[PDB]
Design a protein around this ligand. Structure first.
Ligand SMILES: *[C@@H]1CC(=O)N(CCC(=O)OC/C=C(\C)CC/C=C(\C)CCCC(C)C)C1=O
Ligand SMILES: [Ca+2]
Ligand SMILES: [Ca+2]
Ligand SMILES: [Ca+2]
Ligand SMILES: [Ca+2]
Lengths: 18, 148
């Protein structure tokens, strides 16, 4: 996703994944 | 599924070697369950069957290399742990009321290193706030990132 002035991530915490 | 790099290809081979103990070149639930029981997991025959029939494209009851590789590399399913997500719920719930508000997710996102403004966090809550209370419960928080 393209985000300059917005969150580049969010879900990365619980679905950090392997 | 064989279009990976040689390194990654070697990994699943080593794993395939685990799942094919009889040496027939394919995996059944019995071999699967043996591996699971070895490394520390114990799904039931039905759960075994579920993932078996997912990757088994021949519908022949046995997992071949390409099918295994699909399960191993692509993982087949789109989710991760899911049940531990409710454990992680309490982590986002820093205020500890059984709900996760924007301010709470805001601390947590900062804990990753990747910063965002409060607005970006509020945005996330707006979409995941199904009951529209300004907070997200288990199912709201879960489907905010990992859907069912
Ligand atoms: C850590 C995280 C990761 O992805 N990898 C690489 C793959 C690997 O070998 O991890 C260990 C594998 C485990 C625990 C099994 C995962 C698969 C299932 C639970 C589904 C089983 C279905 C089959 C066998 C058809 C790491 O090393
Ligand atoms: Ca076998
Ligand atoms: Ca097959
Ligand atoms: Ca809270
Ligand atoms: Ca809510």
């Amino acid at each position: 996703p393209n985000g300059k002035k917005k969150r580049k991530s969010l879900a990365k915490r619980i679905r950090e994944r392997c | 599924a064989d279009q990976l790099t040689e390194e990654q290809i070697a990994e699943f081979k080593e794993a395939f070697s685990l799942f094919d103990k009889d040496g027939d070149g394919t995996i059944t639930t019995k071999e699967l369950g043996t591996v699971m029981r070895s490394l520390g997991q114990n799904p039931t025959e039905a759960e075994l069957q579920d993932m078996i029939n997912e990757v088994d494209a021949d519908g022949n009851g046995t997992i071949d290399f390409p099918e295994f590789l699909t399960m191993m590399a692509r993982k087949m399913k789109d989710t991760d742990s899911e049940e531990e997500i409710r454990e992680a719920f309490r982590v986002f719930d820093k205020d500890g009321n059984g709900y996760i508000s924007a301010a709470e997710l805001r601390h947590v996102m900062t804990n990753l290193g990747e910063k965002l403004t409060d607005e970006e966090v509020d945005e996330m809550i707006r979409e995941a706030d199904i009951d529209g209370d300004g907070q997200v419960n288990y199912e709201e928080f879960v489907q905010m990132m990992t859907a069912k």
